Amino acid sequence: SGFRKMAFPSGKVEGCMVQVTCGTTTLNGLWLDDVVYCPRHVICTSEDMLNPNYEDLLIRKSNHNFLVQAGNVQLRVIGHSMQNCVLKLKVDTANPKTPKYKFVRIQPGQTFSVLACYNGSPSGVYQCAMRPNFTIKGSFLNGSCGSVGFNIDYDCVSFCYMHHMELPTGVHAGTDLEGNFYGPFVDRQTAQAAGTDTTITVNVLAWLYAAVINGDRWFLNRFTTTLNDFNLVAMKYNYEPLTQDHVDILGPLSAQTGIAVLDMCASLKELLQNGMNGRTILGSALLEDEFTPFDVVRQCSGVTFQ
Amino acid sequence: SGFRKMAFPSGKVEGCMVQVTCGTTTLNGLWLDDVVYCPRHVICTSEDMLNPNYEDLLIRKSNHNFLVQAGNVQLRVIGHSMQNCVLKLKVDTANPKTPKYKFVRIQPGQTFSVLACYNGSPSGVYQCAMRPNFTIKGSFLNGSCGSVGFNIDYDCVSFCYMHHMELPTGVHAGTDLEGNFYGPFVDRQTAQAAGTDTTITVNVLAWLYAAVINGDRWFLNRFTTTLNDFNLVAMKYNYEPLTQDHVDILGPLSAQTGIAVLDMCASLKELLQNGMNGRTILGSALLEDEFTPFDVVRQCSGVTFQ
Ligand SMILES: *[C@H](O)[C@H](C[C@@H]1CCNC1=O)NC(=O)[C@H](CC1CC1)NC(=O)OCc1ccccc1
Ligand SMILES: *[C@H](O)[C@H](C[C@@H]1CCNC1=O)NC(=O)[C@H](CC1CC1)NC(=O)OCc1ccccc1
């Protein structure tokens, strides 16, 4: 038993990280088959980035201006192009360690693992959720751009995120591997507002189920509620509205625990209105929303990948 | 910026996990050079485990009774022996993916990454601390035994933990890779008490520094304190006593932040005596103690491994 914020094993992604260098800028790239993906601002200088004309800047670059290094060995660049906010460098060598993979554009509320890298080398791995306002709450320093977020489905790696920037509020923004930003962001160094950020209600409920599965049940009550009445309290506390689709998604956990979804909503209501009153749930004094249902079932049935 | 509970990249350990099967019991083993390490209770049956006579049980086993599988390929067992609470199976094949490695016995308060496995296959990776009472707060299900905890020093993997059991309080216990338990535990299915568990004071202070480095500073005050006066409040709240050695260890963080260690202790005093009063620090409503100083410096300077 026990419940921990767990990342996917990172091995298959580790073998795809490379170092990409254009002038004095170095960041991380992702090497799959004979293509290296990285953020296009690798071609900027410190002054470019207030308002880069990326098309104009890339025209001044040729293949040999891109230095790509995987470990100690240099890759030869034989073609370059820009897709949205990412650069694709065609290299002479197919990555022998390329995993089975997919590019996916994830939905808000979904989670994924981040392999934080510097200079093409892994620093660490952690779990993140795509917030409803399309930011993530990561740990990223200068040089971290091009680090990626991924899920693993048995043997397939689904890449979903590439890191590009930090917003004034300290949160992080990035693109899918087609180079489209999540959210309204652009790759220039200006003040940019994210949304008002909301709490992922279905994830909170899933974590309350995890807590019950794992011996924490003090927060359970004798009340119930309705979808509309709960939703009415959701808006108050800036929670996403709960839908029948979410209820259905919680079905397995409601079945495992014998606790109807609306009964759990009622418990969640007395937690929002009354706070936790000094208590804790699964070692936290806050309501956690970065576990999908689906995450919860994964830990509690021991799913594996290798 | 940002601060996240980050695990080491798991690739080098992933290539060492195998499946070990003796009768109907299956668990994980660690394959390094031509040796597979696993918990010795792989030789028990469900009734043995109340009071196993491990020496007697192992005598009934021969090499061919141990089925070791790395992926789809079977390893041949050519010798077996018991060292403390671990079994060492000598196999005919040296693991081609063996990393540079060390076995180490970690100290309470130190942290390490856990690669949670089932049937020889990775499920996920997360960070843990060795608690002062020699337990860890993990996520482990049936079948997880033999999963290991490790650190990485550039290219060297230091294995420090192998999982064996869950205690009645829901926490986890295990051995070093020489098969000696951390703490007073024995590998039998009885009620076993861990210590009173204390809070790792130096780690809390390091996390308060991380919070300051990362823009959270509301908890800072105009007071200071003395080592003995703070320690006197430490005992009250069941914190480890703070020593000059700890102060010295915090030196770099005190230098980075310009906040003297004893000034931070004073802030920690008004947090313990007054609680957080509804506020948060680095996204938590509790005082976190599973970051060593050393962890904090690692994230905040971007250390890498590959
Ligand atoms: C690329 O590695 C870097 C990641 C930033 C660095 C600090 N924390 C991060 O997440 N991204 C940038 O430097 C981008 C440049 C892109 C063209 C926009 N700019 C940026 O993030 O500005 C905010 C910032 C915050 C703190 C320190 C430096 C820059
Ligand atoms: C081995 O895989 C397993 C790990 C336990 C299983 C549940 N959570 C864990 O951490 N270890 C055991 O089954 C050991 C057997 C060793 C000889 C002592 N026994 C044990 O942990 O008993 C407690 C327990 C708790 C919950 C479910 C089963 C067993």
Side-chain angles (χ1 to χ4, degrees):
Chain A
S1 71
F3 204 74
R4 293 297 316 275
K5 196 187 290 181
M6 206 175 302
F8 290 101
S10 65
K12 306 183 149 139
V13 178
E14 286 170 53
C16 306
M17 296 325 288
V18 302
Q19 191 198 51
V20 180
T21 299
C22 203
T24 179
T25 306
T26 285
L27 58 81
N28 308 288
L30 179 80
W31 187 21
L32 300 175
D33 297 311
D34 59 351
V35 176
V36 173
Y37 304 79
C38 71
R40 74 172 169 177
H41 64 271
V42 71
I43 69 172
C44 295
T45 62
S46 188
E47 50 268 33
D48 290 348
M49 290 177 185
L50 293 175
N51 212 352
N53 195 309
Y54 285 106
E55 289 95 353
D56 277 8
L57 296 175
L58 190 60
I59 289 177
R60 310 305 190 290
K61 305 305 181 155
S62 306
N63 290 332
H64 68 263
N65 295 137
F66 290 104
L67 277 285
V68 182
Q69 189 178 354
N72 294 322
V73 70
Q74 317 290 318
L75 303 179
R76 221 185 264 280
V77 178
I78 61 180
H80 61 280
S81 64
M82 177 154 84
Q83 176 179 18
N84 302 313
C85 295
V86 300
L87 198 69
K88 302 198 306 298
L89 307 177
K90 182 175 246 171
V91 294
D92 68 346
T93 294
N95 185 351
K97 299 182 178 162
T98 300
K100 170 56 91 194
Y101 74 91
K102 263 159 170 214
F103 292 167
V104 311
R105 184 156 179 96
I106 55 172
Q107 287 283 293
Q110 288 327 110
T111 55
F112 59 89
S113 287
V114 174
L115 180 66
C117 297
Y118 300 88
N119 297 288
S121 288
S123 173
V125 58
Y126 57 86
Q127 198 61 12
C128 283
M130 194 48 89
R131 298 314 298 177
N133 72 355
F134 295 103
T135 64
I136 75 175
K137 295 174 128 173
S139 171
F140 292 111
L141 301 170
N142 177 230
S144 64
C145 287
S147 293
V148 301
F150 61 99
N151 286 271
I152 306 185
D153 176 307
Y154 182 57
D155 61 352
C156 193
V157 171
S158 281
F159 293 105
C160 61
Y161 179 80
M162 185 177 257
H163 187 54
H164 291 236
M165 57 197 310
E166 179 174 313
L167 299 192
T169 56
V171 298
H172 295 112
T175 67
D176 64 23
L177 276 74
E178 293 187 339
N180 299 296
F181 274 89
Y182 287 106
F185 309 113
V186 293
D187 46 353
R188 67 180 293 170
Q189 278 199 181
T190 61
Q192 303 180 48
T196 292
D197 194 25
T198 44
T199 304
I200 309 150
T201 308
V202 63
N203 291 0
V204 175
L205 299 171
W207 173 77
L208 291 174
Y209 279 118
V212 171
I213 287 175
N214 279 284
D216 282 328
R217 78 209 182 261
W218 64 259
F219 52 88
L220 283 179
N221 73 3
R222 64 180 177 288
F223 313 150
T224 194
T225 180
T226 72
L227 206 55
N228 282 259
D229 167 54
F230 172 81
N231 271 354
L232 185 63
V233 188
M235 194 292 285
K236 176 65 183 298
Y237 287 107
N238 191 358
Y239 270 59
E240 289 190 355
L242 190 74
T243 72
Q244 188 59 42
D245 267 9
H246 296 142
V247 174
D248 286 341
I249 283 164
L250 293 169
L253 287 178
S254 180
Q256 162 146 11
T257 42
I259 297 169
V261 174
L262 293 171
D263 282 29
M264 198 52 102
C265 292
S267 278
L268 179 55
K269 195 170 102 74
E270 66 85 18
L271 287 170
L272 293 174
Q273 293 167 345
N274 299 24
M276 270 162 89
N277 192 356
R279 282 84 70 192
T280 62
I281 303 182
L282 295 187
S284 169
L286 298 180
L287 293 172
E288 290 292 277
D289 77 346
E290 299 220 341
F291 295 100
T292 65
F294 302 181
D295 294 340
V296 172
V297 166
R298 277 193 314 90
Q299 293 189 8
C300 299
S301 63
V303 176
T304 61
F305 309 100
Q306 188 68 259
Chain B
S1 71
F3 204 74
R4 293 297 316 275
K5 196 187 290 181
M6 206 175 302
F8 290 101
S10 65
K12 306 183 149 139
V13 178
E14 286 170 53
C16 306
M17 296 325 288
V18 302
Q19 191 198 51
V20 180
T21 299
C22 203
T24 179
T25 306
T26 285
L27 58 81
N28 308 288
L30 179 80
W31 187 21
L32 300 175
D33 297 311
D34 59 351
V35 176
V36 173
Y37 304 79
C38 71
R40 74 172 169 177
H41 64 271
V42 71
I43 69 172
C44 295
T45 62
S46 188
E47 50 268 33
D48 290 348
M49 290 177 185
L50 293 175
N51 212 352
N53 195 309
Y54 285 106
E55 289 95 353
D56 277 8
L57 296 175
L58 190 60
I59 289 177
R60 310 305 190 290
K61 305 305 181 155
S62 306
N63 290 332
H64 68 263
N65 295 137
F66 290 104
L67 277 285
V68 182
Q69 189 178 354
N72 294 322
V73 70
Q74 317 290 318
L75 303 179
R76 221 185 264 280
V77 178
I78 61 180
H80 61 280
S81 64
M82 177 154 84
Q83 176 179 18
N84 302 313
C85 295
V86 300
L87 198 69
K88 302 198 306 298
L89 307 177
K90 182 175 246 171
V91 294
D92 68 346
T93 294
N95 185 351
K97 299 182 178 162
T98 300
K100 170 56 91 194
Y101 74 91
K102 263 159 170 214
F103 292 167
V104 311
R105 184 156 179 96
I106 55 172
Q107 287 283 293
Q110 288 327 110
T111 55
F112 59 89
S113 287
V114 174
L115 180 66
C117 297
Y118 300 88
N119 297 288
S121 288
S123 173
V125 58
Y126 57 86
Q127 198 61 12
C128 283
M130 194 48 89
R131 298 314 298 177
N133 72 355
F134 295 103
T135 64
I136 75 175
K137 295 174 128 173
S139 171
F140 292 111
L141 301 170
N142 177 230
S144 64
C145 287
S147 293
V148 301
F150 61 99
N151 286 271
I152 306 185
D153 176 307
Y154 182 57
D155 61 352
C156 193
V157 171
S158 281
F159 293 105
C160 61
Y161 179 80
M162 185 177 257
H163 187 54
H164 291 236
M165 57 197 310
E166 179 174 313
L167 299 192
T169 56
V171 298
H172 295 112
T175 67
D176 64 23
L177 276 74
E178 293 187 339
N180 299 296
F181 274 89
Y182 287 106
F185 309 113
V186 293
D187 46 353
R188 67 180 293 170
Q189 278 199 181
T190 61
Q192 303 180 48
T196 292
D197 194 25
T198 44
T199 304
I200 309 150
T201 308
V202 63
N203 291 0
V204 175
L205 299 171
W207 173 77
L208 291 174
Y209 279 118
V212 171
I213 287 175
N214 279 284
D216 282 328
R217 78 209 182 261
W218 64 259
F219 52 88
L220 283 179
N221 73 3
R222 64 180 177 288
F223 313 150
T224 194
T225 180
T226 72
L227 206 55
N228 282 259
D229 167 54
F230 172 81
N231 271 354
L232 185 63
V233 188
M235 194 292 285
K236 176 65 183 298
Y237 287 107
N238 191 358
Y239 270 59
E240 289 190 355
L242 190 74
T243 72
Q244 188 59 42
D245 267 9
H246 296 142
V247 174
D248 286 341
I249 283 164
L250 293 169
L253 287 178
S254 180
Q256 162 146 11
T257 42
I259 297 169
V261 174
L262 293 171
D263 282 29
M264 198 52 102
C265 292
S267 278
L268 179 55
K269 195 170 102 74
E270 66 85 18
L271 287 170
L272 293 174
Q273 293 167 345
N274 299 24
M276 270 162 89
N277 192 356
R279 282 84 70 192
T280 62
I281 303 182
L282 295 187
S284 169
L286 298 180
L287 293 172
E288 290 292 277
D289 77 346
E290 299 220 341
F291 295 100
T292 65
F294 302 181
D295 294 340
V296 172
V297 166
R298 277 193 314 90
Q299 293 189 8
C300 299
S301 63
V303 176
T304 61
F305 309 100
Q306 188 68 259

